[PDB]
Write a protein that binds this ligand. Sequence first.
Ligand SMILES: Nc1ncnc2c1ncn2[C@@H]1O[C@H](CO)[C@H]2OP(=O)(O)O[C@H]21
Length: 170
Amino acid sequence: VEYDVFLSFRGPDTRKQFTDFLYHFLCYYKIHTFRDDDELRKGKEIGPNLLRAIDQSKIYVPIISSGYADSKWCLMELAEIVRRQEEDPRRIILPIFYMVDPSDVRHQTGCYKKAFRKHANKFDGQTIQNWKDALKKVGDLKGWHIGKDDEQGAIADKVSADIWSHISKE
Ligand SMILES: Nc1ncnc2c1ncn2[C@@H]1O[C@H](CO)[C@H]2OP(=O)(O)O[C@H]21
C-alpha cells in the first residue's frame, strides 16, 4: 500500500528510453515502485507529493546521468535524499552510474564544469557548496557502471534481484 523504493533521474535523456526498461521489469517482482514525471514549477518544493513520497520510500536508488548537474530541481532534491539518509541509516542508497565516469562525480569536474559555471550567478555562495558536499558522497557508494558495450538488458535483471533480495530475506 506504500512504496518500498523511489527513483530519480534526468527526464529528457533516460525517462522513456532506459529507466523505463527498469520500471516495468521491477513490477514483475510484484512490488510497488514509484516514478514521477511532473515538471514541478508549482512553487519550489512540494511537501504533499515529492517530500511525502521520500519519507514513505525505503531504498533510494538514484540514477546519475550525464546532465544530472543542470536541472535546478534534481540537485536540490538529491540533497534532500542523502541528508535524510544520514539521520537514520536504516535505509540505503544503490547509485547506478550511466554513460559517465565515476571520476566526474566526486569533484564536479569534466562535463559538469559548464553546469556550475553559470549556476553561481543566481543562488547563494553557501547553497552551492552544500550540493557539491552532498553530490560527492554519492560517488563513493557501491554501483554498477554501465559500459557503452554492457547489455542494457542483463544489468536490469541482475540489479532487480539485488533489490528483491533485500526484501524477501528482510
Ligand atoms: N523539469 C524537469 N527536468 C528534469 N527532471 C525533472 C523535471 N521535473 C521533474 N523531474 C524529475 O522527476 C522526478 C520525480 O521523482 C525527480 O527526480 P529527480 O532526480 O530529482 O528529478 C525529478
